[PDB]
Amino acid sequence: ALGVVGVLESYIGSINNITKQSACVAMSKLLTELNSDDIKKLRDNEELNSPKIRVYNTVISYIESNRKNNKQTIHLLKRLPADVLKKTIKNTLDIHKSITINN
């Protein structure tokens, strides 16, 4: 808990009693920080049948939703079944880590 990354890792890992609401609020903050052009660039570094391309595209779709409306996207994420939400968070965190390391 405390800090976007701490909250999201904790939610995925089922520690620190993170509520669904808190995780989705932190996700919105992370998506705001991510740049979809950066991710499209990472995506295009991949070979044509890399499984990563599909993943990159889902995270691009989250960023685009969040950009149009933060609060609506928080509500949307909160409606995903918890297992679906955690995979969403993991893929987004993974892309955040890649960009951070290579900056």
Automatic annotation (TrEMBL):
GO molecular function annotation: RNA binding; structural molecule activity; zinc ion binding
Cellular component terms per the entry's GO annotation: host cell cytoplasm; host cell nucleus; virion component
Example GO biological process: transcription antitermination
Sorted UniProt keywords: Activation of host NF-kappa-B by virus, Elongation factor, Host cytoplasm, Host nucleus, Host-virus interaction, Metal-binding, Phosphoprotein, Protein biosynthesis, RNA-binding, Transcription, Transcription antitermination, Transcription regulation, Viral transcription, Virion, Zinc, Zinc-finger
Function: Acts as a tetrameric transcription processivity factor that binds in a competitive manner to RNA and the phosphoprotein (P) to prevent premature termination during transcription. Transcription anti-terminator that enhances readthrough of intergenic junctions during viral transcription. Preferentially binds to poly(A)-rich sequences. Plays a role in the association of the matrix protein with the nucleocapsid, which initiates assembly and budding. Also, can activate host NF-kappa-B through association with host RELA.
Family under the similarity heading: Belongs to the pneumoviridae M2-1 protein family.
Name this polypeptide is given: Protein M2-1
Organism (species): Human respiratory syncytial virus
Encoding gene (name): M2
Full-protein positions shown: 73 to 175 of 194
